[PDB]
């Protein structure tokens, strides 16, 4: 901002799956979770499994 002010509008989430190769591809370069692929398990890019 013009007044030397910084604001945060959010953070991008990351999802790690307990099992890959279960994400069925859907048309364009995206994947849809299903059975044998686990829940999204949302996380943060800071530290951990991400």
């Amino acid at each position: 901002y013009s007044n030397e002010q910084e604001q945060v509008l959010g953070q991008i989430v990351l999802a790690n799956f307990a099992n890959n190769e279960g994400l069925a591809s859907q048309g364009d370069n995206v994947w849809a979770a299903t059975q044998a692929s686990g829940v999204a398990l949302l996380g943060t890019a800071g530290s951990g499994n991400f």
């Binding site: 307990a18 099992n19 890959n20 044998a36 686990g38």
Partner: protein, 202 residues
């Protein structure tokens, strides 16, 4: 893998092997086969019970000029050693071990804790060490050490060892090895398969 975090082949049959049981878990060659599963549950910390260090002492070290021991002055103690200790909750204790050379072939070991605001500054002698004619340690190297409670967690009681340490002249005091048996809780990251069939998780 699969939804249940099991090692499964491409067609959908679970893989079996020797199950791992115990604390710490270890492989058993005398148990019946069971399916192998990679758990995702976080592991808990284990209190440090046996810590061992190796300190090389100097025979040519003169006795400190200041007769009374002091905790706020470096010249009061000949050697300082920092050791990491883990309690039952996960708190880290930076235990300070002070070596003082009072006379010939005799050493006084003092223990202090820095992470505890209520910890008492050491004044008396906690351990007495005497070496052989050639500087070989003989006895008295195992000490029962208890830290200070913090955050309502019980203090950790363990055995501190200075075995395999010699006072032969090496120029300056040096610590060559330091080990303990405590770890903070971790999180599942990755798994690898060795050539012995064992699965090791980082």
């Amino acid at each position: 893998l699969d939804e249940n975090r099991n090692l499964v082949n491409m067609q959908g049959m679970q893989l079996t092997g020797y199950p791992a049981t115990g604390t710490p878990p270890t492989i058993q060659q005398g148990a019946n086969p069971a399916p192998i599963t990679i758990p995702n549950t976080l592991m808990a910390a284990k209190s440090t019970t046996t810590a061992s260090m190796q300190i090389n002492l100097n025979s040519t070290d003169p006795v400190p000029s200041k007769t009374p021991f002091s905790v706020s002055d470096a010249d009061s103690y000949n050697k300082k050693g920092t050791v990491t200790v883990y309690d039952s909750q996960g708190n880290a204790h930076d235990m300070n071990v002070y070596f003082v050379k009072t006379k010939d072939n005799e050493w006084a070991v003092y223990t202090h804790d820095s992470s505890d605001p209520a910890a008492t500054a050491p004044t008396t002698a906690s351990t007495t060490l005497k070496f052989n004619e050639n500087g070989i340690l003989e006895s008295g190297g195992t000490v029962n050490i208890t830290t200070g409670t913090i955050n309502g967690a019980t203090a950790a009681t363990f055995s501190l060892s200075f075995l395999n340490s010699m006072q032969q002249n090496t120029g300056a005091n040096n610590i060559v090895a330091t080990n303990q048996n405590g770890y903070k809780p971790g999180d599942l990251v990755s798994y690898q398969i060795n050539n012995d069939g064992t699965v090791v998780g980082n």
